[PDB]
Write a protein that binds this ligand. Structure first.
Ligand code: GNP
Ligand code: MG
Length: 188
């Protein structure tokens, strides 16, 4: 199922799990949040084990960041990461409308199966690529275009996400806000 354009008109301890299609930017997102530095050379498939400290709404939170591999090859073992999750970051890439279509097709059924009633933040990654010339040209040859914010929002509504946010690990735009939202969701 490929995306069709234009159809949308004391410290508290919490476990966060990030999921989404391969290469949609999960690990870079965790790294930029944790280390404040975009990895421009080497990126591990999954980020090192990591507990981040974050203050949100006057509450001090420790966020364990559980990275997962997006590729189908890892489907059998990925559910090992789901028990006792407090919040899910469910990602797609704005430069890949097909990764958005995998939200309802793959990720939402998987997460809702293993993490029933755990809040989901839908996250559009790689926001910097929305108007990027190479991205537009590459997607145009497939009759597609970068994900529009309204398409992300519609999808977040469709899957009953706690919220929808866009970010760019590369530019840092909106990264802090993603994790602040996840923290708010994990707290309530
Ligand atoms: N332009 C741009 N590229 C990004 C951004 N975040 C990550 N990337 C790029 O996207 C590619 C994949 O990033 P990565 O974080 O490894 O993706 P992943 O979702 O962790 N992949 P996997 O599921 O296989 O572990 C890398 O080449 C990285 O440089 C971003 O915000 N903007
Ligand atoms: Mg990764």
């Amino acid at each position: 199922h490929h995306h069709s354009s234009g159809l949308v008109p004391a410290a508290i301890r919490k476990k966060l799990v990030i999921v989404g299609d391969g290469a949609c930017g999960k690990t870079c997102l965790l790294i930029v949040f944790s280390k404040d530095q975009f990895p421009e050379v080497y990126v591990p498939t999954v980020f090192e084990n990591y507990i981040a400290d974050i203050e949100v709404d006057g509450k001090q939170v420790e966020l364990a960041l559980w990275d997962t591999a997006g590729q189908e090859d890892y489907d059998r073992l990925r559910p090992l990461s789901y028990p006792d999750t407090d919040v899910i970051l469910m990602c797609f890439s704005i430069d890949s409308p097909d990764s958005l279509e995998n939200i309802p097709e793959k990720w939402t059924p998987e997460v809702k199966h293993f993490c029933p009633n755990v809040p989901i933040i839908l996250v559009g990654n790689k926001k910097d690529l929305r108007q990027d010339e190479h991205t537009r040209r590459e997607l145009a040859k497939m009759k597609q275009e970068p994900v529009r914010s309204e398409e992300g929002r519609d999808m977040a509504n469709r899957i009953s996400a706690f919220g929808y946010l866009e970010c760019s690990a590369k530019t840092k735009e909106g990264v802090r806000e993603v994790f602040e939202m996840a923290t708010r969701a994990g707290l309530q």
